[PDB]
Paper text:
Because intestinal β-glucuronidase (GUS) enzymes have been shown to convert a wide range of glucuronidated metabolites to their corresponding aglycones, we hypothesize that gut microbial GUS orthologs would catalyze the conversion of TSC-G to TCS. The human and mouse gut microbiome have been shown to contain hundreds of unique gut microbial GUS enzymes, which exhibit distinct substrate specificities toward varying glucuronides. Previous studies have shown that microbial GUS enzymes can be categorized into seven distinct clades based on active site architecture and/or cofactor binding. Our central finding is that specific gut microbial enzymes, notably, gut microbial GUS proteins of the Loop 1 and FMN-binding clades, mediate the colonic reactivation of TCS from its inactive glucuronide metabolite, and in doing so they drive the gut toxicity of TCS.
In addition to Loop 1 GUS enzymes, our in vitro results with purified enzymes showed that FMN-binding GUS proteins, notably [name] 3 (Rh3) GUS, also efficiently process TCS-G. Thus, we determined the crystal structure of Rh3 GUS and refined it to 2.4 Å resolution. The structure reveals a protein dimer with solvent-accessible active sites located ~30 Å from the bound FMN molecules. Using analogous docking and mutagenesis methods to those outlined above, we validated that specific structural motif, including residues F406 and Y430, as well as the C-terminal domain (see the scheme of the C-terminal domain in Supplementary Fig. S10), are critical for processing TCS-G. Again, these mutant proteins exhibited no structural changes when compared to the wild-type protein. F406 is unique to Rh3 GUS compared to another FMN-binding GUS protein, [name] 2 (Rh2) GUS, that we show poorly processes TCS-G (see the alignment of Rh3 GUS and Rh2 GUS in Supplementary Fig. S11). Rh3 GUS and Rh2 GUS also vary in their C-terminal regions, as their C-terminal sequences share only 27% sequence identity, likely contributing to their differences in activity. We were surprised to find that GUSi also inhibited, albeit with less potent IC50 values of 3.7–13 µM, the processing of TCS-G by FMN-binding GUS enzymes. To date, no structure of an FMN-binding GUS C-terminal domain has been reported, as they have remained mobile and unresolved in the structures determined thus far.
Residue numbers in the entry:
A (entry chain B): 1 to 634
B (entry chain A): 1 to 633
The structure:
């Protein structure tokens, strides 16, 4: 009886809302896919208008019709048949609009979508393009007269809470009390709730129902090796149905020993991901989400920081289904603005209500680098206490965290507010030397041994066009990014008290204000390029640390022209032995772990082949008289 | 300094050793690839001759040259430059021949290979074709004067033993003492051993050396999710080098609770596999081994019973590398013969010596269905006790087992000999009803609760060309094989005390005496056809039980013409919900587990689409007036 149709086709988009003619578009859509990815700090920001018609949907007697917007960046006004019905501030979360009373036979839908600079809607100051438009789907949902609530913060009127007790960690034996709370409109009598083959019927009172299932020997959601998911289903006499997937897992974060999953140590070692891509902008299809996740899996990252905003349900689903552990946050970022305080609380409420069921999520992020351009005063601290309190009020099952900028003094009162802290560190890239990452954490953990500390950002830019036999910080070479991550990976491996670490970033991403490292409009800290077509050499150092799929990878497949008489051939591998062949003749076999380095005298054009068991790779190395200038940013 | 050359090309095969002209072949080779797969109980058995030349290889002063045979089925006689040098009985194990003193610049190699019927070399009575020939590679190996022994039972002079102590099962924390024992000739004074990035020099005394490595926090070999492997490497003065991969794992078998790995319950649920394939015979390439394992992995089986003989080193390696737990055995099968007793002990020694290092292997099988055609008497008992004692003498780290024919009474003295037992049961196919599987094991386990019991064979024949809406034991339909395996799967799930279960068989396989189920020369109990091209529908019942890779499978993709007005549509899947679409129209969503059954009215030609999440499958069904007679045996 609950029916959904996608309002995907037959839109007309008006860049100038006042123009007589527009352009045909299909959702998802953004108007900044080109001008937000090419540099110049000039992508178009303002109010634009989407228009489309839709026919009156079939409705039960006293049924309702809702428009569902899953992503309208950043501020949306919904006008139906010339009446304005909704105003939404928050470009990353679902909202819905009851349009029943305005329905005629043919309905005019005008959506004004705004991504302008203002002081009321985060984000406003950040290192990523603020793509405007209807970049996620718009839907028309019809419900019976008695229905699960549709207007509360983009939720679905269901709140499922699995509380897990580990009985035998090694056997994965656990019990679970699963609470299903529901909220309903209309004069309902009772509701039926189905969980794990059991069924209960409970009374509705004041639009609210509750059911607890005491499950024994539940099948744990246990990370990448067994991401088992359950389904909770609630159904009303009149026929309305809602459901959430959920997973059963316990976890804790020990300030000294790190993250624990289901009674066992489970160090979180992964990356971050922005929700855009070359060409498409943030108008991502499902296949694009899946491809991003398939690259996560090949990499073997077991956690993703989904900065800096609520991501698509499809991607959180993918994390659920793949056993990936997620850090989720709101775009409370860089510069505090007093007029945005309510927007921070509104986006946090929608984030938690709409994502509370995802077992992949283990923490709520309050803000990112918020003291990069804010004085630490009572106003700032208050905004953070209110967000912290809201997280704890809505969700007893996850801690709060925030990502701190490296200038924030470690004794600031800011750090005492959330349950955990992670620092964004760029020592050895933006500032100082690589060693300062190690010392920063040794000193924090020595001063504050009872605090949980992590590494929420770290990286260095690499343009796969640039190379050097003597990489150094700032040459933007593929080789220095390897040097940087080789050091960070060892530094992290030495420090099991880091609760989670996240490479910034898995992918290059659009930042229209950047014009650095030979590519206009892109942050090049990705381990993979923005079009997902090139995995940079530094991707494979992490694959060597993380992946269990045997591989060998020769670095320098783009460092072909080499002026030096003896060159380093570097192989990344999760095997323990590698054999190098030069022009078909075996030159040397080394044992080791992860990183294998060979000295090769070169005199002409050579075919270099690396072998370990059944795994092989091959590159060309070509001696030249003078360094190739195309490899040089200078 | 140790060098190996493959003698693969430029052979001449003489099916009649007395005939002046023959057939140029390349190894691997068998002369039975065609006539052992087509029925008639008539493939050629006898002695055949392989001839090749090879150049004298480069040898250090006092170095040695060995011909290495990895598989000569079944009896080989090796003659170099007219001198008879070696006689080997056993078609499934490596042996080596010192040819040093007969070398000249251009060397003649003649190998007589015999797969004849006799009372000396097992196997002689079994349900599989006894392919003859050099069906695995022949190599020329040269070593320095001081070298690890080459002539001890096809081993390489290294015996590596990890003793694992589990410190914390949930954390996978464990220590292991790794003992490396070495045998060598040439009177070197010491040897250097490398294990896990450590090295150690120990003395050589009377051709033997021993080094112990006390590893802490080893990376456990932990089954399919993490088959981590180490290397033991030894190096002599003068340059000779041998090595063995090994894994660190502890395991135990509980008669009530089943198999345990690295401190946790790890029920062994899987398949068997014969080392042959359509067209190639048993002359398999490396890629054929890899494809077989790729199919094991898709299926999700975590154990393989490698019946009925020693398999290729490459395939044992694949099991090591993929975390597959293995049952290994010798072809002491069906019919005891007094003059084959020494051959059972020779093959078992070679099996253990050559495969002791494989962490995948967890038990040694003494015999299969040996009482199918043997009286249980003191002589039969003694042969088994001697095999049992040899396993225990050579290997303190693995239990023995045997596969019992279903006629063998459960109080027989035979059952008291091995450490564990498994029965080959075909209730519901060969005899009796499906329920008798359940009660056979109930009654055994109730009577002997302290004994380890398992299921070493079970299955039903299925010809993918045959189909029926009302399958019956004996119609050979793809659909009855699913009915059979649906029952067996549920029976097995109810009985955690079954230490291991093994579907007979992963693949159809050649049995030249069989003329059954519309295919001559093949046993059709495979879950996959013999050419590896068609996975029968019962394959996907197990994949729904075992695989974690999401999938949806429609049965009946070969059951296309159906006479019924409302036909049954069965989907196998490891998902929780399956939606069926007919001609594009969504028609029904069912929740459930493993097996999803739909009822679909059919009037003409329809397209049936099954969906769950991103997983899709599709078949075509055509309503007909009369049953297609091709679907009927
Ligand atoms: C996932 C989730 C969904 C929720 N859905 C509803 C809902 O539909 N209706 C409701 O009244 N409360 C819902 N709640 C709970 C309220 O947010 C909670 O009681 C809160 O403290 C009420 O605050 P408010 O009434 O000011 O919005 C939900 C909570 C969670 C975690
Ligand atoms: C894997 C493995 C390899 C062995 N290799 C040799 C060897 O090369 N030389 C040797 O004298 N014994 C070797 N042994 C010797 C064992 O002591 C021997 O097989 C058994 O105890 C007695 O052997 P025997 O009766 O043939 O002397 C090996 C044992 C194993 C398990
Ligand atoms: Ca621009
Ligand atoms: Ca034949």
């Amino acid at each position: 009886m609950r029916n959904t149709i996608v309002l995907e086709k037959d839109w007309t988009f008006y860049k100038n809302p006042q123009s007589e003619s527009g352009e045909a578009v299909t959702l998802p859509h953004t108007w900044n896919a080109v001008d937000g990815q090419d540099g110049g700090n000039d992508y178009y920001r303002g109010t634009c208008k989407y228009v489309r018609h839709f026919a009156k949907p079939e409705l039960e007697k006293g049924g309702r019709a809702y428009l569902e917007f899953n992503g309208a960046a950043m501020t949306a006004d919904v006008v139906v048949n010339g009446t304005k019905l909704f105003h939404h501030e928050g470009g990353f979360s679902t909202f819905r609009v009851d349009v029943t009373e305005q329905l005629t036979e043919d309905n005019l839908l005008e959506v004004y979508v705004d991504n302008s600079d203002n002081t009321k809607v985060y984000p406003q100051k950040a290192d990523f393009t603020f793509y405007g438009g209807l970049y996620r789907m718009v839907k028309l949902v019809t419900v019976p007269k008695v229905h699960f609530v549709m207007d509360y913060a983009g939720g679905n009127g269901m709140k499922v809470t699995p509380e897990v007790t580990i009985l035998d960690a090694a056997e994965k034996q656990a019990d679970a009390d699963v609470t299903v709370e529901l909220w309903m409109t209309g004069e309902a009598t009772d509701v039926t709730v189905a969980v794990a083959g059991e069924t209960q019927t409970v009374p509705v009172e004041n639009g609210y129902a509750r059911a607890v299932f005491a499950l024994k020997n539940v099948h744990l959601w246990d990370g990448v090796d067994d991401p088992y998911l359950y389904t909770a289903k609630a159904e009303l006499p009149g026929g309305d149905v809602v459901e959430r997937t959920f997973g059963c897992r316990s976890f804790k974060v020990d300030s000294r020993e790190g993250f624990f999953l289901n009674g066992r140590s489970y160090p979180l070692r992964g990356v971050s991901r922005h929700q855009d891509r070359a060409g498409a902008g943030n108008a991502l299809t499902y296949e694009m989400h899946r491809e991003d996740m398939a690259i996560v899996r090949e990499l073997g990252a077991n956690t993703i920081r989904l900065a800096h905003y609520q991501h698509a349900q499809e991607f959180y689903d993918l994390c659920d289904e793949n056993g990936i552990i997620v850090w989720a946050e709101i775009p409370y970022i860089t510069m505090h603005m007093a007029d945005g305080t309510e927007n921070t609380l509104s986006q946090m409420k929608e984030l938690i209500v709409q994502n509370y069921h995802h077992p992949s999520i283990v923490c709520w992020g309050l803000s990112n680098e918020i003291t990069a351009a804010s004085a630490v005063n009572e106003e700032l601290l208050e905004n953070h206490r209110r967000l912290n309190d809201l997280c704890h009020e809505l969700d007893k099952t996850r801690p709060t965290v925030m990502a701190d900028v490296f200038m924030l003094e470690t004794d600031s009162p800011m750090l005492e507010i959330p349950d955990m802290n992670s620092y964004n560190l760029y020592f050895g890239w933006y500032i100082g030397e690589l060693d300062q990452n190690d010392s920063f954490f040794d000193e924090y953990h020595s001063t504050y041994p009872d605090r949980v500390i992590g590494l929420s950002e770290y990286g260095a830019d690499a343009n796969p066009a640039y190379h050097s036999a003597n990489p150094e910080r700032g040459d933007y070479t593929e080789e220095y990014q390897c040097v940087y991550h080789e050091h960070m990976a060892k530094m992290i491996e030495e420090r099991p008290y880091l609760w989670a670490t996240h490479v910034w970033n898995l992918f290059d991403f659009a930042a229209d204000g950047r014009d650095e490292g030979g590519r206009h409009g892109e942050n090049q800290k990705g381990l993979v390029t923005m079009d997902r077509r090139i995995k940079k050499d530094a991707f494979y150092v992490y694959k060597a640390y993380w992946s269990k799929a045997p591989f060998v990878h020769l670095c320098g497949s783009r460092y072909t022209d080499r002026a030096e008489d003896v060159t380093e051939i570097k192989v990344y591998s999760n095997q323990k032995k590698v054999s190098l062949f030069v022009d078909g003749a075996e030159k040397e076999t080394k044992e080791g772990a992860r990183i294998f380095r060979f000295r090769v005298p070169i005199t002409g054009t050579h075919t270099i082949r690396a072998v370990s068991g059944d795994c092989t790779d091959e590159i060309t190395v070509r001696k030249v008289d003078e360094p190739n200038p195309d490899y040089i940013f200078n």
